[PDB]
Amino acid sequence: IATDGGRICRPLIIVSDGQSRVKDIHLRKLLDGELDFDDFLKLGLVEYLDVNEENDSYIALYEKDIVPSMTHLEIEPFTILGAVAGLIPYPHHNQSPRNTYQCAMGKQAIGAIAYNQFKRIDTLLYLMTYPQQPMVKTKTIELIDYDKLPAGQNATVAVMSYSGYDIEDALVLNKSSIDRGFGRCETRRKTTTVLKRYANHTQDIIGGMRVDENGDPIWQHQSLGPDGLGEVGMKVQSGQIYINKSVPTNSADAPNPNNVNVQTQYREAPVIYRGPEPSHIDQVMMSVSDNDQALIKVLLRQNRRPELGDKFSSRHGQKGVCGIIVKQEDMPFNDQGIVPDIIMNPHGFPSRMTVGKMIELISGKAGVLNGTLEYGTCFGGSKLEDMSKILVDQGFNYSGKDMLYSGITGECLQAYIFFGPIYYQKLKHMVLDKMHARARGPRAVLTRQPTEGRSRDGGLRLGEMERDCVIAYGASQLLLERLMISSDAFEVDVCDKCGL
């Protein structure tokens, strides 16, 4: 008998004499709104079990699998899936590594974070301009309130080898889909300045807007504003000022009983927007902190567009980057006249067991044709035959294999194409934050080699394994160039009698 606190438990339904203790009448009381789960606990219908208690009991899964020797019943099977894994549609048809990758990946999805996001100032934020709820959803989505605040878009997907640009899990977007607003994501960043009051009763002053001899604002301060804080709405480019700060010239405190009443000048120590693409100021906020100082926060934003490099996911893994962006005229089309939005390679299915994506496509097509959101909850949900019947009732193929027409040459495709709506997410790992170039740049003071990181204009490591691989070719001059000429070259003087 264990009485400790800190053990993990689960509620089950006690079963005795081959009959579940929760009859239909108790379910009727629950559905009427009364007899909360606490009440079912009090009447003794449901019981908490830990793994220590489950060792001697006998639990059943479905109602059909009752034997007189059971003691408990599992209340629903899809408790076995967690909250993050709950978004996956038909994951019992998928493979386990796909579910693992989806769990590790859906947390990087771009979508609206909360209802109060535009009054919120965080250190990094990504918002999708046009969210959409997943067409093939799960009871977990209805429960954890996910469809109300979604993240991702429903793309019409044709599964075919459009060109060589769509090989090894890459994707092909539509130029007339991106430009109409597909995957249009905006990114927000925060910049904070605290105007500390030093012991000399000297504090930073934001004042000043530089003007040249012509009488107009300088290019460095084109969006600085009158007070010294960059105006909201104005464009900000690379190499400009939006908080024209100034720090006292007497950096060392050295508390002075002397007069020094006037001419306590300041030196310019501003924050410079050294980002690589344009951004807009959307909020400027000022506050007084707990220690009664001045606190300035600026929210910058940029509305990036999908391009080559951005990642996309399918809620079954199958991640990938956009490879090419083809115009609408070159994409296939069907009898109705629709062109797909994203084309994926059919080589991602044999090696990844991703049948759940196919069932999701068929269920989503049946849903959009019929008009209702269709459940795909794990261990159950909506079956395949009814969706096939809906697809044939509206006048389509049973497997979604609609006949297409190749826009390049106007001919009928000699093989049918899998066609339907799949829900895709745009991940935060985008090309525009990962491009890098070094040339000649800053050096560390202790080794006089290139620094590390793209936040310091650093370079790339040429590790020991790459050094061995270059040795493996017989490249001597290249190795000498890489590791001596252009990395840390130094002229030294050596005395060749002692040797130091």
Partner: peptide, 13 residues
């Protein structure tokens, strides 16, 4: 009207 199949309604509560 109510069956043993729709027993998952305990989970929302």
């Amino acid at each position: 009207i109510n069956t043993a199949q729709d027993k998952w309604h305990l989970l929302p509560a």
